[PDB]
Write a protein that binds this ligand. Structure first.
Ligand SMILES: *[C@@H]1O[C@H](CO)[C@@H](O)[C@H](O)[C@H]1NC(C)=O
Ligand SMILES: [Ca+2]
Lengths: 102, 129
């Protein structure tokens, strides 16, 4: 067996501020390669046409992405990391907007 | 502070970092490095591009780096994320029928259309909630 882990589940937004979003997800339930950490990627239609890697070496299944812009649409996906590399992407999260800065 | 165990003499190797704990020094490999033979005092670069590795994904050429790696696009391909590229920028060429209020994102297979927040639909059509 020399394969990466399975793809995690769709990340769920659990909390929103004007500069941060908190996400949670689960490892792939199918028996497979062991997960050693997670990678988080973010997309915004106002921030370029590629996904930006916003966190890596994430040990937990919950993490807060900070340094975001107010009143902005973000989408997120997670990859699982293992001995032989990265999983394919999880499903993309439902889009959310950060809170406004009033 | 505590005693500087690291300053007593050489301990950790070239790609390793000495840390003072309460009672002893310890060695940890630098980021992106791994023990050569089970001893974290002596580390070597992880080769993320070695055979059977899958750090880089579709339509990329893996480039190994000291402590890192990079996934370059196959010539002619356009980036989706750090790990994958795609043949065409379908979103930027009009090769899509996304709703006016749907977000277009390139994928390895083509593109997706996602209704923006507050709207419902399958991305080809979106209606306010
Ligand atoms: C979205 O719905 C329309 C009709 O409501 C349909 O013609 C189109 O194929 C659908 N697109 C997807 C991706 O399901
Ligand atoms: Ca490397």
């Amino acid at each position: 067996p020399s394969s990466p882990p399975g793809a995690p589940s769709q990340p769920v937004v659990t909390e929103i501020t004007k500069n941060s979003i908190t996400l949670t997800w689960k490892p792939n339930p199918q028996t497979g390669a062991a997960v050693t950490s997670y990678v988080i990627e973010a997309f915004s239609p106002a921030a370029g046409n590629t996904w930006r890697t916003v966190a890596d070496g994430v040990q937990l299944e919950t993490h807060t992405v900070s340094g975001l812009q107010p009143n902005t649409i973000y989408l997120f996906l997670v990859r699982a990391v293992g001995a032989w590399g990265l999983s394919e992407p999880s499903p993309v999260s439902e889009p959310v907007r950060t809170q406004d800065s009033e | 502070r505590g005693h500087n165990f690291c300053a007593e003499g050489p301990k950790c190797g070239e790609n390793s970092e000495c840390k003072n704990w309460n009672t002893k020094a310890t060695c940890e490999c630098k980021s992106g490095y791994i023990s050569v033979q089970g001893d974290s005092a002596y580390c070597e670069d992880i080769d993320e591009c070695a055979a059977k590795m899958h750090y880089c994904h579709a339509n990329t050429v893996c480039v190994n780096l000291p402590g890192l790696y990079r996934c370059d696009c196959v010539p002619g391909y356009i980036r989706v994320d750090d790990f994958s590229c795609t043949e065409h920028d379908e979103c930027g060429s009009g090769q899509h029928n996304c709703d006016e209020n749907a977000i277009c994102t390139n994928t390895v297979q083509g593109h997706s259309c996602t209704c923006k927040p507050g709207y419902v639909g399958n991305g080809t059509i979106c209606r306010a909630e």
